[PDB]
Amino acid sequence: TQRIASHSHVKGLGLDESGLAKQAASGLVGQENAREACGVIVELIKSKKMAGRAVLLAGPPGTGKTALALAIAQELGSKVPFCPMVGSEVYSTEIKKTEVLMENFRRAIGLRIKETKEVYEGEVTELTPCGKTISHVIIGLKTAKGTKQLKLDPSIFESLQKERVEAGDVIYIEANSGAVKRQGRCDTYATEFDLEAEEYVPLPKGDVHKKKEIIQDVTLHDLDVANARPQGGQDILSMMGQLMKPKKTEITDKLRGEINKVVNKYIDQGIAELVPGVLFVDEVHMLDIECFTYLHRALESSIAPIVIFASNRGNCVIRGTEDITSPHGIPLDLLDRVMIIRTMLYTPQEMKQIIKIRAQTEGINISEEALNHLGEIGTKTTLRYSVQLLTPANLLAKINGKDSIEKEHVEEISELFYDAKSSAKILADQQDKY
Amino acid sequence: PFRDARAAPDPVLEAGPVAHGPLPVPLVLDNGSFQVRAGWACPGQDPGPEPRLQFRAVCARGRGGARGASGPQMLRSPFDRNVPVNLELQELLLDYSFQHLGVSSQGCVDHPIVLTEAVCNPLYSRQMMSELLFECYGIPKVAYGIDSLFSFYHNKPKNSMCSGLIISSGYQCTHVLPILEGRLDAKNCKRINLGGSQAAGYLQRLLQLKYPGHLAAITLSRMEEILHEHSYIAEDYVEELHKWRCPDYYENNVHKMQLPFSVFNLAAYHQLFVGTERIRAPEIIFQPSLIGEEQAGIAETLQYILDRYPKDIQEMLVQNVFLTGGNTMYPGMKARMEKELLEMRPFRSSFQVQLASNPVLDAWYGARDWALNHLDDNEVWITRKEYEEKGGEYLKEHCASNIYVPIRLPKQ
Ligand SMILES: Nc1ncnc2c1ncn2[C@@H]1O[C@H](COP(=O)(O)OP(=O)(O)OP(=O)(O)O)[C@@H](O)[C@H]1O
Numbered sequence: 001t002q003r004i005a006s007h008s009h010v011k012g013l014g015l016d017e018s019g020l021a022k023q024a025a026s027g028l029v030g031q032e033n034a035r036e037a038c039g040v041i042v043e044l045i046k047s048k049k050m051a052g053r054a055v056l057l058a059g060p061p062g063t064g065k066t067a068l069a070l071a072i073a074q075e076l077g078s079k080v081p082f083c084p085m086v087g088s089e090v091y092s093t094e095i096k097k098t099e100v101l102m103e104n105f106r107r108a109i110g111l112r113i114k115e116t117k118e119v120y121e122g123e124v125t126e127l128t129p130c131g132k133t134i135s136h137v138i139i140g141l142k143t144a145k146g147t148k149q150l151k152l153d154p155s156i157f158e159s160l161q162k163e164r165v166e167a168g169d170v171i172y173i174e175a176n177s178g179a180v181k182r183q184g185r186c187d188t189y190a191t192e193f194d195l196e197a198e199e200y201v202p203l204p205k206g207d208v209h210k211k212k213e214i215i216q217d218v219t220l221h222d223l224d225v226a227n228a229r230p231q232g233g234q235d236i237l238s239m240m241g242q243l244m245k246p247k248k249t250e251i252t253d254k255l256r257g258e259i260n261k262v263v264n265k266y267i268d269q270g271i272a273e274l275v276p277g278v279l280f281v282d283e284v285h286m287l288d289i290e291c292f293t294y295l296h297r298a299l300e301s302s303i304a305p306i307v308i309f310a311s312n313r314g315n316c317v318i319r320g321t322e323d324i325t326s327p328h329g330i331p332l333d334l335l336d337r338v339m340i341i342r343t344m345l346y347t348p349q350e351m352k353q354i355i356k357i358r359a360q361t362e363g364i365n366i367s368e369e370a371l372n373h374l375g376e377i378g379t380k381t382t383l384r385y386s387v388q389l390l391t392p393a394n395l396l397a398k399i400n401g402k403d404s405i406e407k408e409h410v411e412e413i414s415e416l417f418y419d420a421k422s423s424a425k426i427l428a429d430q431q432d433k434y
Numbered sequence: 435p436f437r438d439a440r441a442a443p444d445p446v447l448e449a450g451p452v453a454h455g456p457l458p459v460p461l462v463l464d465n466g467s468f469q470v471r472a473g474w475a476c477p478g479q480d481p482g483p484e485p486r487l488q489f490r491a492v493c494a495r496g497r498g499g500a501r502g503a504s505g506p507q508m509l510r511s512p513f514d515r516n517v518p519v520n521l522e523l524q525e526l527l528l529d530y531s532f533q534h535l536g537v538s539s540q541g542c543v544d545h546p547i548v549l550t551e552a553v554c555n556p557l558y559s560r561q562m563m564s565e566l567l568f569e570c571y572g573i574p575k576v577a578y579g580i581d582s583l584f585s586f587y588h589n590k591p592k593n594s595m596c597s598g599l600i601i602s603s604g605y606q607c608t609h610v611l612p613i614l615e616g617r618l619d620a621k622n623c624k625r626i627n628l629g630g631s632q633a634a635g636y637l638q639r640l641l642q643l644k645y646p647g648h649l650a651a652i653t654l655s656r657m658e659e660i661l662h663e664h665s666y667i668a669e670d671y672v673e674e675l676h677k678w679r680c681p682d683y684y685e686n687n688v689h690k691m692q693l694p695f696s697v698f699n700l701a702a703y704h705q706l707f708v709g710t711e712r713i714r715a716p717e718i719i720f721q722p723s724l725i726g727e728e729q730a731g732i733a734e735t736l737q738y739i740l741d742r743y744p745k746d747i748q749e750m751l752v753q754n755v756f757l758t759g760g761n762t763m764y765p766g767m768k769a770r771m772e773k774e775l776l777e778m779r780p781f782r783s784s785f786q787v788q789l790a791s792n793p794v795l796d797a798w799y800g801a802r803d804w805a806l807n808h809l810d811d812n813e814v815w816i817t818r819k820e821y822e823e824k825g826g827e828y829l830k831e832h833c834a835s836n837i838y839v840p841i842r843l844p845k846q
């Protein structure tokens with residue numbers, strides 16, 4: 001099964017059809033005024049009209065900022081790109097800081113393409129080329145459902161020859177890609193010799209020929225990166241690929257210009273469609289003043305995605321200024337370009353509901369008398385700490401041969417694993433020893 | 435446990451069961467290699483009422499020298515590989531058949547006859563079979579046809595022009611016969627030199643090597659029972675034998691053939707356990723390489739004839755694949771044939787496999803229904819006087835008969 005993790009219980013914003021929030025729904029509780037606001041952002045991203053518009057989620061640690069940001073990615077679903085990043089990712093050793101911003105801004109915009117995937121497979125019954133030189137090659141295929149003939153071009157024939165295919169081999173051709181794969185010799189010939197180095201496979205039991213409709217997702221960034229440096233062209237088989245190690249590089253402005261111009265051609269022809277997505281720059285206060293200034297340009301550009309920011313700082317110093325304080329750790333100049341959503345601390349009853357939702361997500365049975373105790377301990381410590389104790393408590397209940405958390409299990413665990421507040425009290429006492 | 439076969443029935447009749455209408459009621463004679471099947475045409479009755487004389491085509495004459503015997507009872511038989519090639523051992527087989535059916539009296543059989551022959555018959559052989567028939571027995575008119583094609587004629591949906599492959603498998607041969615517009619396309623017809631005789635011979639020799647302690651207990655007439663009652667044809671041989679490899683399947687499916695009794699007596703009066711053997715005997719016609727023999731077998735041959743036509747008439751003649759004769763009686767034969775056929779056709783295309791209504795008797799019933807219709811079509815038959823100007827190497831090209839060619843044999 002899938003591993004359980006820190007946000008796997010949230011399944012959406014869980015708003016009603018009028019846009020208002022429900023008390024407890026889709027794996028979130030509380031926060032009505034703050035998560036109704038995400039509803040409006042989801043409508044804005046689904047509208048496709050806008051570019052570069054941006055949002056800041058603000059509020060203390062453990063109040064739900066990344067949970068809400070991931071809830072938005074659920075409401076959009078896998079049709080629309082959602083690129084998460086951490087502020088600290090900007091400091092590469094291969095490229096300038098603004099290049100990392102610009103790559104990630106491109107990643108959040110997707111081309112969506114359609115094609116009919118078409119596959120031929122089976123034992124090769126014959127190969128016959130077709131004047132002076134090969135015009136086409138006829139090939140016959142067989143499976144336990146029948147036989148077909150195909151008419152190959154000389155490019156595909158070169159690929160069959162490179163795979164060392166001969167009659168009696170079992171082959172997979174994909175007609176769109178021009179992909180060709182040898183899968184071994186057909187086992188009807190497995191007695192040609194007693195020992196020979198080949199691997200023999202049974203004749204396929206599936207259809208000779210299959211069709212699907214498939215959808216291809218690719219972002220503008222993928223086009224940039226693929227087209228900038230020469231594509232290596234090595235299906236291995238070529239030792240020149242060994243010498244020049246890859247590295248990232250500053251993509252030039254001119255190339256992004258041409259890529260924009262070619263993609264516009266294809267969305268006029270109906271071959272592709274465009275999905276403006278979301279970039280989630282989490283941990284934003286870790287950006288430098290240089291980068292914060294470059295955002296004033298990229299958020300204005302009439303191509304950019306929607307950008308979501310989040311921060312937990314009070315009035316701290318802006319990185320790289322050595323001096324200047326500003327709200328949320330973000331420069332005032334940029335803070336006047338974002339709409340702000342505040343995020344609020346939980347009352348004890350809210351934490352009880354979060355704890356129960358985590359318990360039944362994580363797979364643990366818990367008695368009411370024990371759940372009231374984790375509720376209390378959450379008010380003394382923090383929600384993110386009470387939710388840690390569930391699994392270790394279950395694991396002691398299991399060692400003592402019981403199915404369900406009871407008071408003495410959480411009480412034992414509380415004495416065995418400390419909180420940052422109570423550990424800091426120890427460090428203040430034994431001060432001279434560390 | 436084994437049985438023993440019956441012998442010496444009581445077929446005796448009056449001098450001729452002549453019905454109303456035309457007096458010269460013909461004899462219908464399936465001159466088989468394993469057994470002969472013979473009787474009166476008996477017109478005007480829809481079900482053929484009495485295909486009398488079901489008897490093995492073998493004769494006795496021993497160290498005594500002075501006498502011979504012919505009915506179901508050291509031994510001899512008149513055929514070499516499904517063509518008759520004996521003089522008096524054919525006569526005393528015909529004699530038995532006529533005498534038990536009744537005959538008029540005078541120095542000939544007064545009735546015309548329809549007689550089965552080999553898919554191709556050597557010219558000398560046809561000439562001899564005509565001579566040994568017109569000279570000795572004095573028949574007024576004669577018809578030759580092929581067993582398989584009579585069985586097809588019987589099994590057709592309608593008395594109309596057709597196309598198909600016939601799959602046929604008798605004592606010492608199997609044939610694949612492509613037919614178009616009612617005519618055997620004998621230019622590209624093919625046969626395999628194996629058949630149910632050779633299966634029994636192989637199953638004998640296997641069990642002799644499995645139990646040398648009692649060679650004498652196992653003999654052809656007991657091999658017949660295990661091959662008729664207890665053997666089957668695989669859908670795919672290398673998969674069947676693979677599920678036969680595990681002991682828990684083996685013990686549930688092996689056949690316990692108790693010999694007659696006089697240690698629990700099996701050290702000689704064994705239960706002759708047949709496992710894999712009950713597959714390896716049927717399979718000979720699909721894989722003659724289980725014996726020494728290098729020939730294509732019923733699978734590769736069908737493809738090898740079917741790829742020698744235009745792609746439209748293939749899809750025509752495969753619309754009627756027909757199974758008839760001897761070995762097709764095995765259980766599972768239709769399934770193996772239609773699976774093997776599915777791999778060697780265009781991916782979405784259609785085919786049909788039909789099994790004869792009674793695989794062993796339909797050759798005779800076919801010859802009955804044919805003769806009973808074509809009584810007065812005097813272009814179809816060879817008349818007694820024609821044999822005096824055409825030397826016996828001569829035939830009349832009706833449907834369900836071998837293809838004639840202009841030719842003559844020197845004789846003095
Ligand atoms: N309203 C809520 N409903 C359900 N679970 C919540 C809710 N708010 C927070 N959580 C859960 O509690 C934890 C809160 O993480 P949270 O989103 O507060 O991180 P944060 O401190 O805001 O920001 P960061 O991700 O930078 O640490 C997660 O386990 C989250 O899934």
Ligand SMILES: Nc1ncnc2c1ncn2[C@@H]1O[C@H](COP(=O)(O)OP(=O)(O)O)[C@@H](O)[C@H]1O
Pocket residue numbers: 465466467468469516581603604605606629630631634661662663759760761763764794
């Ligand atoms: N019920 C049966 N199951 C299996 N094989 C059978 C069965 N009946 C007959 N045979 C086989 O049929 C063969 C004879 O068929 P037949 O049509 O009489 O031959 P032909 O026309 O060449 O004389 C024999 O080899 C015998 O083993």
